[PDB]
Amino acid sequence: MSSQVEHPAGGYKKLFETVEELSSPLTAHVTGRIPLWLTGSLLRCGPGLFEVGSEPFYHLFDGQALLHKFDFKEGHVTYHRRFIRTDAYVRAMTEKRIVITEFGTCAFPGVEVTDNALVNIYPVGEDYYACTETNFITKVNPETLETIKQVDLCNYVSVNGATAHPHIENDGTVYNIGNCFIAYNIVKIPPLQADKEDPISKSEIVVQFPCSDRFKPSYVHSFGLTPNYIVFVETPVKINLFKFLSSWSLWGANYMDCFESNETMGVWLHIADKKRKKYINNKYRTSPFNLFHHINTYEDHEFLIVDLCCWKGFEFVYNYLYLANLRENWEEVKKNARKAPQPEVRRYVLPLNIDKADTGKNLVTLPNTTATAILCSDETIWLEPEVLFSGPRQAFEFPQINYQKYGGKPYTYAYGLGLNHFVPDRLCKLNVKTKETWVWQEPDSYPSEPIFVSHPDALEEDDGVVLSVVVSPGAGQKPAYLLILNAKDLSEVARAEVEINIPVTFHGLFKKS
Amino acid sequence: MSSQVEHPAGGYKKLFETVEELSSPLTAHVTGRIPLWLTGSLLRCGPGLFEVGSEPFYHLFDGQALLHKFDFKEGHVTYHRRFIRTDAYVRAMTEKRIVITEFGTCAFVEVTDNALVNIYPVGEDYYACTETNFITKVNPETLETIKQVDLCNYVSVNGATAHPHIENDGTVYNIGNCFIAYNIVKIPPLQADKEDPISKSEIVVQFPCSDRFKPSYVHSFGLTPNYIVFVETPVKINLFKFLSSWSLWGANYMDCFESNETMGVWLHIADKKRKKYINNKYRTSPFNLFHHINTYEDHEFLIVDLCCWKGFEFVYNYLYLANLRENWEEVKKNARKAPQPEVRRYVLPLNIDKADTGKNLVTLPNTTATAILCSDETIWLEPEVLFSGPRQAFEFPQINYQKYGGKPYTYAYGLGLNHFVPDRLCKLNVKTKETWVWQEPDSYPSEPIFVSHPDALEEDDGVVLSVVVSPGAGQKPAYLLILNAKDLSEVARAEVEINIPVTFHGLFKKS
Ligand SMILES: CCCC(CCC)COc1cccc([C@H](O)CCN)c1
Ligand SMILES: CCCC(CCC)COc1cccc([C@H](O)CCN)c1
């Protein structure tokens, strides 16, 4: 973990304030020691333009995509940023107004889907793509930050969109999930082959998950992956297709206007056989929650361990993320969040071998968990979680692990961004076996998602650092900095200060050079 | 909290072995220093006779009630025990066989009065109880049995729990099934006329049943200055089996239980002072519940701290003596598919505004518990988990009851169960989730009972007392353990030269 800080000075407002791009990189001023083995680029995406002239964007996810880069070489750091030349951005700059409808901001005058790639960036073959959650992803140059092209996934595969959280196997194979308007489809993009053709042209749907409601598919943000299984969590946050596919020009609608909460379904969990490409018909059921981020998933004897960042309730958490709410003063921010769903890290355990003879009993026979799974007579398997972390309006969010070596596998550690009534104000580490936590936090300092980078000679799982971008608007300080923490105990190793503001960023990666 | 010990020697079997009563008290041999302010009697109940001749009792809750007493005076300790002369026991001794049907043992009809579970004060009297209509008046100084009391002669219930709440003026509240509702009984304090307060018993409020024909098993309930809290679980009593003739079919109490798979848990509150059921449909996931820890009011909310078991299967299925007497690897294996124990805090909003439909009503600043108002007006609850360990139950909870019962509090003491075997003592800070453990190898404790220093201003300024069975051959068979309530460090122990079997509940009676 929890925060030990209040924010009466309101400095978190700087996260949602427009900035200018740069012509070329700035030097970041180092204190402490940047590790000499740290060579490459921290790439991250966020909104950077929160109004076009006098027309405001209303939601956290509406501001125009800004691509950020911190470069590390021989103990020195540079910072650079460029707006992504999406259709949304280019047309806004041409017409000097909001032209494309964003997540929570209707544009005044069917109509074009946004390609505002403000959320994440990921590798496909030798390319990098910035994304949001629509059918449009934007190819970008990781060295110059130039925009290369728009890619419409609809030209290649049968999905209406895909999440900003594809899984990436160590050979470069990419898996993602997307709505299909009815199913949820797993897309597979293979590694780059000898022929050097673009791997997106070899995309395919490999398996399909069914929908609980013919006309109302669930919002999906992420999914789990193990060597043998795919895990999909179907939440009660629904997309109303009667509103989504109606004409938005007539009604004046945006994406937020299409969400509704199903009160009675709870959460349905789904698994598929990855290698045999087959949906498994196990009716896993539990209580209602929102889910954005899976932490990690793995196999342990005949069971799937599913670690999740949950929000307890069926109301859509995105309702609390209009910019007007996030720009309020601190007492009002806390008050507004009182009735929101509560964040909680939970471990669910999914049995793979269901024996009818155990009807009415707990199938989770593993020795090291308090998670349960009850086989009912109607063949639903009712799940209860083991709670790994819980604090009052203190979210362990934007989870990251040592992904390259422990993604999809037995693991011990997760790193997170700590939210305090939705305001990011600390960095966290969680031992998922012991429930021990570590916190890093300074007054009036607003961090981003921490990204893990392994030491080249790592023996343990947490032999490395985490990198986070911190906004520090206190007038006795430079506006922002890159923070490097030792992954062992979250003690500070270095920081690299820059003389300009940085707004909120969501996700990213470290690209080794 | 969790245990750090395995039990391959099987010493826990001594908890379920018959013992002989005593003719008069033994001296318990003290090591360390019994506090000189500790003056009175630890009274506790458990089974003590696990077979009548060659006829065995089958279930944990079948053996014949044994009343135990440790006396504390000027740093000296005595131990004494007597079988309760119930109808079940007396008739068994007369007829040299099992005459009355017990919880899980059919006799080859009359309701059992085997008062093996607890003891509590009414007026100037003490009553040993089980969970039926029969409670047994007993003498707290001599351990003699005085009389049988049939609650049905006084109030409209079929039984009452072994966990009545006791207000500081001596008023007693309890809950019992009525065969259809759950009735709260109130027994007033002793008046000037000196008449027996049981004759002034009354039903003050009634909770509805979720199923006309299948009432829930009820073990305990919550009480605050202003409210009564009742948790209706999916463990049901099948009245078609309960009220059928058991002589023909050969049935016991265990044979009447079934689990409702779809209802989950329904939580109920009543206005205590206005004697009125409140129509708030609190709903959550399925669990068994035996013991409320404590209940209190905080702004417009009820804080409900519970020892839960995650699942709808009846936990009592895992407590046949044959299972509990298995070797350690088999005990662990048998418990793998049982419900998981978990301490949970639920938060019940009292002011429900329809304008908040679809939102979380729990606006308190210090909890992660939630309560969602649905369109059908059910309020769906999620807990804050306070303690969770794999088959490691924080159970038999106790608090500083006299000063913090029904009120804001910080500390609970518990007996730690390891795949159902009691092997440690625990303390839980319910605000910080910090835990403390006391544990020795091959040592099987009982429920810890808290005794305040008489002049304490703080909540945990006192000791806990537990009766520990220690069958290791380098030790006396049992002892009374005294721990400092601050940190569970040992203050003293009082060893006795005879075995003591399992005990369930009890009290400390100040003299
Ligand atoms: C009706 C919903 C539709 C759903 C995709 C439908 C294929 C998602 O749509 C969008 C649109 C714009 C922005 C975003 C952001 O990525 C959300 C925050 N990460 C998602
Ligand atoms: C069908 C259930 C009936 C129910 C009472 C219904 C008036 C409870 O009956 C009994 C009978 C005998 C022993 C016990 C033990 O106290 C249980 C463990 N504490 C309860």
Ligand SMILES: CCCCCCCCCCCCCCCC(=O)O
């Ligand atoms: C650094 C962000 C701070 C302000 C917003 C925090 C509220 C986050 C709520 C949970 C995560 C929602 C998903 C956002 C990340 C994403 O778009 O992938």
Ligand SMILES: CCCCCCCCCCCCCCCC(=O)O
């Ligand atoms: C000291 C007891 C150890 C062996 C039995 C432990 C199993 C306990 C399961 C939860 C509590 C069950 C109710 C027992 C207390 C009572 O009868 O009032």
Ligand SMILES: [Fe+2]
């Ligand atoms: Fe995300």
Ligand SMILES: [Fe+2]
């Ligand atoms: Fe009990």
Ligand code: NA
């Ligand atoms: Na600090």
Ligand code: NA
């Ligand atoms: Na010890």
